[PDB]
Amino acid sequence: QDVVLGLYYMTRDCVNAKGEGMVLTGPKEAERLYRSGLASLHARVKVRIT
Amino acid sequence: ARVTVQDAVEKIGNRFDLVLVAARRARQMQVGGKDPLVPEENDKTTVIALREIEEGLINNQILDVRERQEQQEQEAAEL
Amino acid sequence: VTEFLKPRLVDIEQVSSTHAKVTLEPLERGFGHTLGNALRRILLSSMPGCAVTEVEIDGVLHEYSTKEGVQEDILEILLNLKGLAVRVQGKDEVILTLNKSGIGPVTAADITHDGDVEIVKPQHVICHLTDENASISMRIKVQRGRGYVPASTRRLLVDACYSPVERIAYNVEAARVEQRTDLDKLVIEMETNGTIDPEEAIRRAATILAEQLEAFVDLE
Amino acid sequence: FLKPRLVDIEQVSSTHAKVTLEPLERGFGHTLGNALRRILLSSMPGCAVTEVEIDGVLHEYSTKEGVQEDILEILLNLKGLAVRVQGKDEVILTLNKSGIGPVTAADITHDGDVEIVKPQHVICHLTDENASISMRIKVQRGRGYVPASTRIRPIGRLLVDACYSPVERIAYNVEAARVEQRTDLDKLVIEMETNGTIDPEEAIRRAATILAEQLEAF
Amino acid sequence: KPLVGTGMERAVAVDSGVTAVAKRGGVVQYVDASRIVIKVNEDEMYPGEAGIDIYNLTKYTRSNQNTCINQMPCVSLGEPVERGDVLADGPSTDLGELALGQNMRVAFMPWNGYNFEDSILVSERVVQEDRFTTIHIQELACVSRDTKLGPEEITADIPNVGEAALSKLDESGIVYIGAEVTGGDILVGKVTPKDSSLRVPNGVSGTVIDVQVFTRDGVEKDKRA
Amino acid sequence: EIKELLKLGDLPTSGQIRLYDGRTGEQFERPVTVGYMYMLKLNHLVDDKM
Amino acid sequence: REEAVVWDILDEVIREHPVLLNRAPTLHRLGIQAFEPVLIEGKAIQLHPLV
C-alpha cells in the first residue's frame, strides 16, 4: 500500500519523456540521469544490463 | 553480527537441536571459563555460539567429545 | 551558540577500488541532508572531467546502420565509447584514432597514444571483429566539460559524461553523543569511473562547494 | 567557475526582505538556495524570553485580579516577543505598568543594550483603575527550539518555552542573470521573513559560515 | 474555531452550559480574568433592588476525565451585550462557538513511509506553537484516620527523610501552592504511630495549583485549613 | 461553489499546488493536495499508555 | 537518577538480546515475533512496516 505504490509509479511508462530516445549504458547511468533531472522516471530508454 | 540463523540450521538440521547445542555452548562461554573458538566482534555468547555452529567447528557430537575429554583429563589430574 | 558539532570522517570503508563508502558523524540535527544533498548535487552534475564527446567512423555516417565484420551495432559502439574513462592534460579537446584489423576484441589499448592522453582501462572493450578482412577505424573526439551533457541538447554524437562520479548516493541515519537525543550520521556511497579516487572526489566536491561560499563567509 | 556575491538586499518590510546572489553557475542556484534555506530555518541564533517572574503570581495556572488574561496567556504573549539584545547574551527586562489599558511591549523599561523591535506587541490588558503588573522578563540568546521541560527554582519563577529562531519563512528562486556576453548563468533570490531581530545580510553570512565550517571536515 | 463548520457549533457550545452566557442584557462594567460584571439595562431591571449581574468564571479545575475546564472572557471592558449571548468561552469553545481541535495545513502525500498505514507526520512548528499542548489536572488525596495507638496527624516532622525531602512542604506539613513537583516528591506529611505521608506517584510531574482541606467538627483546625 | 471561492482568492481551482521537498529542494513530480483540515487531539495519550 | 553512564551500559545490554513483540488478539503464531531492539527517544514502540 505504499511500497507497492512507489514501485508501481517507478516502474511505469509514459509515451513521452524528458529523454525518451537516449540509450543508457547501465542502471547507474539511469539513476544519474533521473537524479540530475535530465530524464523522466517513465522514459522509454534502451539500457545495457547484465 | 547475526541476523539469520539459516546456515546454523543447515549444519544442525533440526532447528530444535540447534537451540540446545547453542545454549550449551553459550552457557560454557558464560558460566564456564571457556573462550570462543572464533574471533568475536563484541557479540554476546549466544551469537558467538551460533556463529561457531555456522563455521562448522561445533555440534552436539563435538561438544560431547570435548566434555568427555576434559572430564577424563580432570579425573586424571585428580589422582 | 555559534559552535556546532563538527563531524569527522569515521571511516572510508572501500569495496574494490572506485567504490568507496565514507561515514561522517555526529552531524548536527538536520545537517546530514544539507551536506549530503549539496555534495550529491555537486558530484553528480557539476564536476570537471574529460569524456568522449563525439566519434566519426569512416565506413558509416548514420547512427542506425551496420559495418560489415563488426559484431556489435554502432548503437552499441557508442555505448562502449561512453564508458571510456580518459584523462587529458592541459589540452581542452583531443582526437584519437582506432585503426585495427583482424578477428578479435578491440580494446582501449589499441588507440593511438596521443602523448599525455591517458586511458585508465586498457581492458575496456569497444568492439568485436568477425572477419580477418574486416578493418575498423574511427576518430574519437574527447572534450573537457562539466557534468552530464546528453546528445539531444547538442559525425555521430555521444552522450558526454564529463563527471567522473558514476553513482553517488548518501543515506542519513541516527547517531548520538552521550546525551544528545537524535543527531545525523551521513553515509555517502560513491563510485567513480577509475579516473579519480572517491575519497578524492569527495574532497574535490567539498572544495568546489567551499569556494562558492567565500564572498559571504565570516572567516570564523 | 564563477562565484556569487550579495548584489542587492531589498528590505521591503520591517520583517521580511529579499537578498540576491549573482552570478551563479548552472545547477548551483538550487544547491546553494536549498542549503542556505535549511541552515537558516534550522540554525540561526536569536534571543527569546525564557523565565518570567510576575509579582504576586505563583504558578501559570492562576489569574491576577485586574488583568483580563490568565497568566498562561501572558506567558504565551511573552513567548511571542521580539527582542534584539546587543552586547550580552542574557538580560532581565523589567515591565512596570498601572492603570486601565493595554500593556504593549513599549511599556518595557529596556536597557541600552536591548532593542524591542515591535513596540505595539500587546501582552495583557489591565481592566481595573488600581491594578498594576510588575514582571521580570529574562531574555537570553540561544538557538533552535529548547522547551522548558528539557532544560536542566523558587515557586515564583515561571518557565516559558524558548524559540530562538528569528526567521519564520524562507523561500528561494533561481532565474537567469544579466551578464554582458554569457548565458546559462543563474541568480538566486532568497526571500526571507524574520521577526525583525536579525539582519538579512548577517543571516546569509552566518548561514554560509556554518555551511563552510561543516564542509571543513574535508 | 473550525474554518469548515456546520453552523451547529454555536448551538452545541451554548446549550452544553460550559460557556458563561448573559442572563440579562446590559453593558460590561468590569471584566477580570475570573469574573464579569454586567450593568443591566433599566429596561430589564426589576423595580426593586435593581443592581447588577455577576458571573464568576470557573477557572482552572478538574473534569471527570482529569482534564482542565476553564472559562475565559470573550468580552471587553465597556461593551454592550444582550440576553443569551456568550460572555465567557468555556473549555474548547471560541467566541461561543464549539472548537474541538486546530485548523492545520495538511498535505495528502506519502512521505518516506512515516505515514505508512494510518500514521500522521507532524511538523515541528506544530509542537513549537504549543497548539496541541493540553492541561491535565489530577487530584491526590490524603486522609487522616484515628487508628489505634492514637490518631494520625499532619505534622511535617517526618523521620528518616532528608531536608531536601521536606524542602517543598511548609511548616504546616502540606506542599506549597505552586511548587513544581516531580515523581517521588512528598506532597502531604502524615505520620504512623509506632509513615503514611502522601507522596507523588511514580512518573507523574506537574505543578501544585490548589490544596484543599476538609475538617469534621471536633477537630479544631490547622492554620493552613 | 468551492472552486468559485478558491478563485475568489488566488488559489488553484483544482485545490492542488506544487510542493517542494524540504530536504532535497526539488519538486514532487505531481501537484499534491494541500489545504487546511481540522485536526483533533484524541484523549489517548502515549504517556498514559507506556 | 539515570546517570549518563547507565545509557551505554544499557546500549551494551541491549546489543544482541531479542525482545518479543506481541499484539493482543494473538490469532496465529505470527502475532508473537522476536526483534532486536534499537533504543529510540520517545514512548512509542517503532515497528517495522513489513511485519
XYZ file of N, CA and C in Angstrom, chain D residues 57 62-71 73-74 100 124-133, chain E residues 20 28-38 53-60 70-78 87-89:
168
model
N 2.254 36.276 41.474
C 1.846 35.088 40.738
C 2.763 33.942 41.132
N -2.999 30.224 37.280
C -3.736 31.122 38.152
C -4.049 32.395 37.386
N -4.721 33.321 38.057
C -5.075 34.605 37.479
C -4.706 35.712 38.451
N -4.642 36.931 37.926
C -4.309 38.103 38.720
C -5.489 39.060 38.674
N -5.907 39.542 39.840
C -7.049 40.441 39.930
C -6.735 41.778 39.275
N -7.310 42.023 38.104
C -7.074 43.266 37.400
C -6.768 43.081 35.931
N -6.063 42.011 35.587
C -5.708 41.726 34.202
C -6.819 40.905 33.573
N -7.002 41.081 32.269
C -8.072 40.416 31.539
C -7.679 39.025 31.066
N -6.423 38.637 31.245
C -5.924 37.392 30.689
C -5.342 36.536 31.801
N -5.425 35.222 31.618
C -4.766 34.307 32.530
C -3.255 34.492 32.438
N -2.547 33.999 33.453
C -1.094 34.062 33.416
C -0.544 33.218 32.278
N -1.866 32.981 29.236
C -1.923 33.795 28.029
C -0.854 34.879 28.046
N -0.559 35.432 29.224
C 0.541 36.384 29.344
C 1.861 35.713 28.992
N -5.810 51.433 33.672
C -6.600 50.749 32.656
C -5.964 50.922 31.287
N -0.871 42.015 27.863
C -2.100 41.768 28.606
C -2.809 43.096 28.804
N -4.094 43.024 29.125
C -4.920 44.209 29.301
C -5.285 44.368 30.768
N -4.975 45.531 31.335
C -5.399 45.868 32.684
C -6.774 46.516 32.617
N -7.723 45.979 33.380
C -9.103 46.435 33.325
C -9.584 47.098 34.606
N -8.710 47.315 35.582
C -9.088 47.943 36.836
C -8.330 49.253 37.001
N -8.994 50.235 37.617
C -8.390 51.554 37.774
C -7.163 51.517 38.673
N -7.121 50.589 39.628
C -5.963 50.404 40.502
C -5.549 48.940 40.408
N -4.783 48.629 39.367
C -4.240 47.298 39.151
C -2.924 47.459 38.413
N -1.875 46.840 38.938
C -0.540 47.069 38.409
C 0.178 45.742 38.243
N 0.893 45.601 37.139
C 1.751 44.449 36.909
C 3.200 44.897 36.970
N -20.133 30.910 29.853
C -20.812 31.837 30.752
C -21.623 32.769 29.868
N -21.041 45.877 29.832
C -19.953 45.345 30.638
C -19.361 46.452 31.498
N -19.292 46.210 32.808
C -18.754 47.183 33.743
C -17.361 46.843 34.239
N -17.004 45.563 34.304
C -15.694 45.143 34.779
C -15.453 43.720 34.308
N -14.395 43.514 33.528
C -14.019 42.185 33.063
C -12.659 41.851 33.645
N -12.618 40.837 34.491
C -11.395 40.277 35.030
C -11.103 38.984 34.287
N -9.992 38.343 34.635
C -9.762 37.000 34.125
C -10.645 35.971 34.805
N -11.300 36.330 35.913
C -12.068 35.365 36.685
C -13.441 35.878 37.098
N -13.880 37.029 36.598
C -15.236 37.483 36.865
C -15.640 38.480 35.794
N -16.940 38.546 35.540
C -17.527 39.521 34.632
C -18.690 40.178 35.357
N -18.822 41.491 35.202
C -19.882 42.256 35.844
C -20.681 42.935 34.740
N -21.987 42.707 34.724
C -22.882 43.306 33.748
C -23.781 44.301 34.462
N -25.431 42.136 37.501
C -25.268 40.694 37.391
C -23.788 40.361 37.455
N -23.438 39.337 38.226
C -22.049 38.940 38.408
C -21.892 37.492 37.974
N -20.903 37.243 37.120
C -20.607 35.914 36.597
C -19.200 35.549 37.037
N -19.093 34.627 37.988
C -17.801 34.139 38.450
C -17.384 32.981 37.554
N -16.347 33.198 36.753
C -15.921 32.184 35.804
C -15.222 31.038 36.519
N -15.394 29.840 35.976
C -14.786 28.637 36.531
C -13.366 28.536 35.998
N -12.391 28.916 36.816
C -11.001 28.903 36.384
C -10.466 27.477 36.465
N -9.145 27.321 36.332
C -8.510 26.021 36.133
C -8.932 25.011 37.184
N -12.021 25.410 31.867
C -11.505 26.726 32.212
C -12.198 27.745 31.330
N -12.891 28.695 31.944
C -13.606 29.727 31.213
C -12.781 31.001 31.185
N -12.714 31.629 30.015
C -12.044 32.911 29.898
C -12.971 33.870 29.167
N -12.976 35.147 29.540
C -13.933 36.082 28.943
C -13.672 36.289 27.462
N -14.754 36.480 26.709
C -14.658 36.845 25.305
C -15.175 38.253 25.060
N -15.469 38.999 26.122
C -15.922 40.377 26.009
C -14.802 41.291 26.481
N -14.979 42.592 26.287
C -14.004 43.578 26.713
C -14.714 44.628 27.550
N -13.922 45.428 28.255
C -14.474 46.442 29.141
C -15.269 47.477 28.353
N -16.441 47.829 28.876
C -17.302 48.806 28.238
C -17.800 48.374 26.876
N -20.683 35.470 27.273
C -19.741 36.372 27.913
C -18.377 35.743 28.133
N -18.323 34.455 28.445
C -17.049 33.768 28.581
C -17.104 32.437 27.853
N -16.001 32.110 27.191
C -15.838 30.849 26.489
C -15.395 29.793 27.487
